[PDB]
Design a protein around this ligand. Sequence first.
Ligand SMILES: O=C(NCCC(F)(F)F)[C@@H]1CN(c2ccc(Cl)c(Cl)c2)CCN1C(=O)c1cc(=O)[nH]c2ccccc12
Ligand SMILES: O=C(NCCC(F)(F)F)[C@@H]1CN(c2ccc(Cl)c(Cl)c2)CCN1C(=O)c1cc(=O)[nH]c2ccccc12
Lengths: 306, 302
Amino acid sequence: SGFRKMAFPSGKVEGCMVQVTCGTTTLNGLWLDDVVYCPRHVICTSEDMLNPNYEDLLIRKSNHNFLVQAGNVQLRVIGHSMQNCVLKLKVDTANPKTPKYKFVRIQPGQTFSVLACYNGSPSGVYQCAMRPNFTIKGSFLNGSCGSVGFNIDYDCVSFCYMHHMELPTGVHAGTDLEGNFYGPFVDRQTAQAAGTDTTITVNVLAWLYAAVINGDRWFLNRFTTTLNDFNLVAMKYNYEPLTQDHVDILGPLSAQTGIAVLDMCASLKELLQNGMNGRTILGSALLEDEFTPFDVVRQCSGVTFQ
Amino acid sequence: SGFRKMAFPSGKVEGCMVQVTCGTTTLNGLWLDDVVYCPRHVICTSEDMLNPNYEDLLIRKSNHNFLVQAGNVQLRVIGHSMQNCVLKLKVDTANPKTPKYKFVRIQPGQTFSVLACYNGSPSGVYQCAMRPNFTIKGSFLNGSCGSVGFNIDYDCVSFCYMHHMELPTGVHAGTDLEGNFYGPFVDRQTAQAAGTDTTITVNVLAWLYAAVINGDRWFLNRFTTTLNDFNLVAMKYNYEPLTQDHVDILGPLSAQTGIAVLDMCASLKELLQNGMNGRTILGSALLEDEFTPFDVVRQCSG
Ligand SMILES: O=C(NCCC(F)(F)F)[C@@H]1CN(c2ccc(Cl)c(Cl)c2)CCN1C(=O)c1cc(=O)[nH]c2ccccc12
Ligand SMILES: O=C(NCCC(F)(F)F)[C@@H]1CN(c2ccc(Cl)c(Cl)c2)CCN1C(=O)c1cc(=O)[nH]c2ccccc12
């Protein structure tokens, strides 16, 4: 029993974290085989942050302008290139701890684990979701750029995020490992701000199913609703529309609990209109939307507490 | 910026997790140097659980009754012994991945990272607090026993918890790595249940400071209170009393924010008496008590 924000074990990623220094700027890099990946803004200087020309900045660099350190070991940079917003430093040594890995771009509403790192050294691991507005509500301080987000399936690490910057609201923005930003953000100094965000409806429903599996049933009701009438309520409360595919994805949780999806929707409708009246669900007094259906099935028992 | 329930990187502990099988019972063990540590109830059978005599059960075992499995490599057990509620299986191979480590027992109100494991294979990592009633609100399924809790200081892993059982309310109980249970719980079948719990006051205050550091200020006010007047309110809402040592511990956070500890106590008193009026603090609609002052400083340096 129990339900926690649970990250993947981080050891496979810890063995890939290195420190990349260019000029007086130091941040984290990801060392996989003989390539080190890091944010390209490591080559920026305080003078040129307003509107940097990265092709110009890079052509003016040599291999010896990049210092890479893995633990106490210095890695010799033998090549450098840019792929969109990531720098790729070829080094003369393949990482012996390289796991099986993939570069995967995730969808808004999907979750991943973040390994927060500083000076090439991991400090903590936590679970994040990609917001509908393509920000993440991370926990990052100065020196954290180059930290990565990932999922692990079987023994394979699917890297999905590299951290680049913090927006004025305190949320965070970054790229996939191909250097393509999540959302309408750029690696320069502007009045960049997160767009309007919405609540991830399918995830809230998944979390209500987790609660039923864990014995919280107070919010259930006899009522039901149509998909269209629920979506009318969702729009009013800044929830994402629920699709038939989402209803299908919730199938296994529906089957394990014996609660039809549209019955759980009726329950969510009442929670939005009435609140919780001082009660809690899975130790929260608000509707949590950063657990996917997959996270719920992964963590919860296969049998319901009847 | 930002504030998350953050666990320690788990790699150093993942390299220590093994699978222990005795009879038909399989659970997790912790492999450090040439010793494997696991819950002694691995030697129990379904019949002998109302009043197991672990001395009797263990004298009836030999080394070959224990199968230890490190990934795909079977470790040969060359000795077996019991230390309180943990079993110690001496194996013919020292773990080459043994980190620097200590066995430390934690206090109620302190936090640690849990590496949830199944069949010797880690599955997830999350942060936990030891409740005042010596339970932990973990997330554990069948096969999770022998999962460990730990903190990391520099390079050294301080193991503080090994998972033994789940209580009827869905909370969890276990031992330190010397095999001594946290709280009044036993590794046998009884009606045992979690005792009355309280809210960890010093941690709530630490989390309010984390909120202020991250820009949540709506709960602040110009009012103050005395330590004794606050503790009168704490007792009314089932909060632990606040000590001067607690006030001292909160000093750095008070200094960083410029908010006196007793001023934050006044804010907490109002939050306890009035609620949040539909507002939130660091993304929560309730007062969180599973972050220590250390956790807040480690994560809120800026
Ligand atoms: O300020 C930095 N440190 C030296 C970089 C310099 F100044 F030398 F350039 C970096 C680099 N940085 C950046 C740089 C260039 C460009 Cl073009 C762009 Cl888009 C971004 C973003 C901020 N950074 C963080 O580490 C950071 C990440 C975070 O999530 N939260 C924070 C909260 C507070 C303070 C810092 C951070
Ligand atoms: O029930 C079990 N499974 C093997 C049964 C056999 F073979 F041991 F009999 C174990 C062993 N087990 C125990 C055993 C002996 C003794 Cl003396 C004592 Cl005090 C306890 C406790 C429950 N267990 C868990 O793994 C477990 C931990 C958890 O946190 N949540 C759960 C939620 C649901 C289901 C299981 C779990």
